[PDB]
Amino acid sequence: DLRLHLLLNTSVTCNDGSPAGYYLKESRGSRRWLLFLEGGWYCFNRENCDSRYDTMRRLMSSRDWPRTRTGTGILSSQPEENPYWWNANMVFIPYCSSDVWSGASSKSEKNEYAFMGALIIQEVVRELLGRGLSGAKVLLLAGSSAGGTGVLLNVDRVAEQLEKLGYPAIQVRGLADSGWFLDNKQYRPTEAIRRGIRYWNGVVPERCRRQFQEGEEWNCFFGYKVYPTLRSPVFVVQWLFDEAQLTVDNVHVQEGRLYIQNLGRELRHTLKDVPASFAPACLSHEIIIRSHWTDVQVKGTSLPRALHCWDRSLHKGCPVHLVDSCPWPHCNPSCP
Numbered sequence: 001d002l003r004l005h006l007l008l009n010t011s012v013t014c015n016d017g018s019p020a021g022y023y024l025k026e027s028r029g030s031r032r033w034l035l036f037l038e039g040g041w042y043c044f045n046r047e048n049c050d051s052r053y054d055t056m057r058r059l060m061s062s063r064d065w066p067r068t069r070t071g072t073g074i075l076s077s078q079p080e081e082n083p084y085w086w087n088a089n090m091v092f093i094p095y096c097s098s099d100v101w102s103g104a105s106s107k108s109e110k111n112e113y114a115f116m117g118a119l120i121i122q123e124v125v126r127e128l129l130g131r132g133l134s135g136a137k138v139l140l141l142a143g144s145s146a147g148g149t150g151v152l153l154n155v156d157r158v159a160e161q162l163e164k165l166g167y168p169a170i171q172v173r174g175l176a177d178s179g180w181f182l183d184n185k186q187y188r189p190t191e192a193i194r195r196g197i198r199y200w201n202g203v204v205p206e207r208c209r210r211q212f213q214e215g216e217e218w219n220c221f222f223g224y225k226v227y228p229t230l231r232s233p234v235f236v237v238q239w240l241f242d243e244a245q246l247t248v249d250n251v252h253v254q255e256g257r258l259y260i261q262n263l264g265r266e267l268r269h270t271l272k273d274v275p276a277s278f279a280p281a282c283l284s285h286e287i288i289i290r291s292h293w294t295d296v297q298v299k300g301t302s303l304p305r306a307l308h309c310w311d312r313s314l315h316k317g318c319p320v321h322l323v324d325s326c327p328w329p330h331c332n333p334s335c336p
């Protein structure tokens with residue numbers, strides 16, 4: 001169980017102005033820290049955010065959050081469920097900003113909702129420094145789906161924050177799960193991201209802005225465009241046939257088969273120069289906080305093993321780049 005703490009800086013809020021927070025379980029003898037970003041799509045104008053407020057309020061408000069959550073998958077403390085980092089200090093940061101973790105805008109007389117996802121991450125880091133983070137050796141920023149994209153948008157800023165606060169000895173790394181999307185042609189979203197960025201006052205990593213410049217920052221929400229610009233190590237976990245990708249492609253089998261196969265091949269191609277990556281040929285969504293995340297294997301190697309191999313490589317038979325080459329979903333027998 002991770003215990004809830006609401007942010008002491010009450011100017012950092014969820015969408016409706018209620019305070020944001022984080023769930024924590026410390027591990028007294030460990031210098032490793034895992035900060036996980038929850039997913040759950042986004043909203044991009046008032047009408048669309050109003051609908052989300054009626055039926056997905058826990059992703060917009062803390063007023064109904066429970067006092068504890070159970071850690072599962074990579075957030076488990078049991079070595080059988082989590083061979084990789086079971087002894088780590090565990091943090092679960094709920095998603096209540098609906099901005100793919102990019103926003104820096106307070107609720108005010110001109111704004112019905114607050115979009116502060118980028119500021120929420122920074123404030124969590126600040127408040128953890130007085131709870132043991134100041135003696136850390138590694139901080140792994142992880143996240144799933146919209147939280148996976150949020151890792152890519154925020155990992156370099158966390159490292160920059162700790163450097164300027166005087167902690168250059170903490171190694172910041174990222175783990176992006178199911179947040180690596182393509183801006184491809186539909187079978188029958190870029191505009192939604194572009195409009196949300198303006199609604200949210202969203203921010204993107206600095207080198208990626210300087211390349212694409214004003215009006216085009218929406219490009220930095222796509223992994224294969226922002227990843228080459230990042231300075232911190234980032235491991236990428238991504239199903240070749242991600243369910244959210246097929247949704248934004250209007251896919252829900254006759255020859256026009258070719259579309260799904262072309263999607264698998266293109267996502268394969270974008271990962272060719274990503275040295276640390278795990279990409280099975282499955283139709284599914286998220287993996288790292290699910291209880292049976294140890295079951296999936298790529299070419300004989302499990303995901304917890306690959307993450308351990310990544311750890312050693314940052315210090316034979318322990319690979320870190322694992323991408324399936326079969327071109328149809330569920331061709332890998334270990335798919336969920």
Ligand SMILES: CC(=O)Nc1ccc(OCC(=O)O)cc1
Nearest residue numbers: 039040041145146189190193244
């Ligand atoms: C261009 C675009 O639409 N990108 C995108 C898609 C889905 C997202 O979230 C899915 C989830 O959180 O399940 C977040 C961002």
Ligand SMILES: *[C@@H]1O[C@H](CO)[C@@H](O)[C@H](O)[C@H]1NC(C)=O
Nearest residue numbers: 009010011012119120122123
């Ligand atoms: C509280 O958070 C806001 C937004 O990030 C920041 O401007 C302000 O300086 C913070 N206050 C304190 C006391 O940390």
